[PDB]
Symmetry: C2
Subunit: 162 residues, 2 copies
Amino acid sequence: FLELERSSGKLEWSAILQKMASDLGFSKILFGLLPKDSQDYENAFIVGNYPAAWREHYDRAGYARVDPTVSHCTQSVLPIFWEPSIYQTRKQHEFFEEASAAGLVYGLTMPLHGARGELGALSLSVEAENRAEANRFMESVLPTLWMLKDYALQSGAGLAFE
Amino acid sequence: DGFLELERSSGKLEWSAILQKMASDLGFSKILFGLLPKDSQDYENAFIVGNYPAAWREHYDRAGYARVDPTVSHCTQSVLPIFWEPSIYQTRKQHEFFEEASAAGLVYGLTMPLHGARGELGALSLSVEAENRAEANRFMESVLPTLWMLKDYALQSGAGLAFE
Ligand SMILES: N#Cc1ccccc1C(=O)Oc1c(Br)cc(Br)cc1CNC(=O)c1ccccc1[N+](=O)[O-]
Ligand SMILES: N#Cc1ccccc1C(=O)Oc1c(Br)cc(Br)cc1CNC(=O)c1ccccc1[N+](=O)[O-]
């Protein structure tokens, strides 16, 4: 985990974070961080390899207002898994479908809350044949991820703010 | 699913018992969970849970050890754990803090900073009984991934119990 601190620049930090996630078994990740008292997700510090077109679509369609993981992050420090049960509203169903169209169907979002009031998320997606399989993979690496997200927050906020 | 009993708990007594049991199973026989609401700086009226000896908690406050305890300034700046380690260029007060902590049975341990979703500031401090630093670090490192999960479950349920 200590390799995140020693990185030079955003590209290398991103490369390290992506490979950590990739080696762990998650093909796609997004790391997003906002300063205290901001809700302008559009203009967050963002790192990762989500498809560019999806990132653009998410911003355009105002999905930050709809995405169930966003509101979850404002209320909690606990992970939220991308299960059918989290897409409760008709608009969130639309969100699920569009995210699925980008290849992002299985995964989880770890809320980030920094020492300086930074608000963020580390979202990770896993390629799987089905839900049950994806859930077992995620369970099998969850403690490692749980440490990872805080190491990423601490180093990530360092990169973005100091 | 073991972590779920922290939310199911009704009242501080019940919650404290569950948290202590979970921590004790992991080899931490003494714990203190401390939490302050958003923008509050006064460590006295903090929501404090655990089984640190009462006399030690009283003395820590009385002697003003919070300004000498390295974990305090660490917690305001980081979300990463800090292992208890004296500075070894230390002031009489810093020496006394560790000496009196040690006398209270709290020589080895770590503090997990707590930063809640609603701006809560706190710490989960846990002590392990050990003969030396090598043994202690072994004991703590071996449960660190589980503890990492526990501190966030404790933070989330504790904040609700305390403020919500
Ligand atoms: N900064 C910050 C931030 C702070 C709090 C919560 C969240 C975020 C965040 O990054 O949110 C985004 C953004 Br800004 C763009 C995208 Br694109 C995706 C997410 C978060 N959501 C997901 O990654 C997600 C969650 C569930 C299903 C599918 C996705 N997804 O594919 O985007
Ligand atoms: N709330 C909050 C809080 C918020 C941020 C940081 C810290 C705390 C905290 O609880 O700090 C205390 C207090 Br209030 C009393 C006691 Br008693 C002990 C600690 C934290 N420190 C330790 O537990 C500790 C750390 C290093 C060596 C020895 C000890 N110790 O035995 O107390």
